[PDB]
Amino acid sequence: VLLLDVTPLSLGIETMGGVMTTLIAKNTTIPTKHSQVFSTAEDNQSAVTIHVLQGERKRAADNKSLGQFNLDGINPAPRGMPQIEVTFDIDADGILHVSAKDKNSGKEQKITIKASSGLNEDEIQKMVRDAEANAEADRKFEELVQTRNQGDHLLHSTRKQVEEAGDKLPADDKTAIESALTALETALKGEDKAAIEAKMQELAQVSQKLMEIA
């Protein structure tokens, strides 16, 4: 055949740290359906926000928002535990159905997005061009977010571990850990990946006894 219908740009959702994660790649023939299981970004979350995105950039804010919805009623649990199945299905008339369902609670939400939604032909060409011209900066942003998400989880794990080790943790180590936490939290806000990793290292250095308690 010399012609067929595709979805012209990648579709997916925003994940922890403001990244676009793709569920359906650009130029995939329609109809088509793809699912992926996600979890929660922090301990004790009872909801997730599904922000639907069209485009080829790694920063979620640089793609086109198609809409969003919340999935609520998740039993609060340790980060990474809930299994949230997200499904994107585009039918033959180009209408996109996105759903998310929490396996444990059985709660589900969805949205329907009309086929005329999203970017037009010139914006599609520009999105492809801009992704190409900014490829190196986007890979660097993805690397930074990976390191921020690890630093963020180490910040929360450490505070939890300080808690679990009440008085067992010497007073002076608590003080040193707390200062290193502050420094890590500051580095996470910046955009220098090595600086964040360096603060995680410095925190590991004062956490030796904290680790022994575990």
């Binding site: 979890s39 929660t40 997730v48 926000t49």
Partner: peptide, 7 residues
């Protein structure tokens, strides 16, 4: 690893 969603 598994990707994560905020609240």
């Amino acid at each position: 690893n598994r990707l994560l969603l905020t609240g």
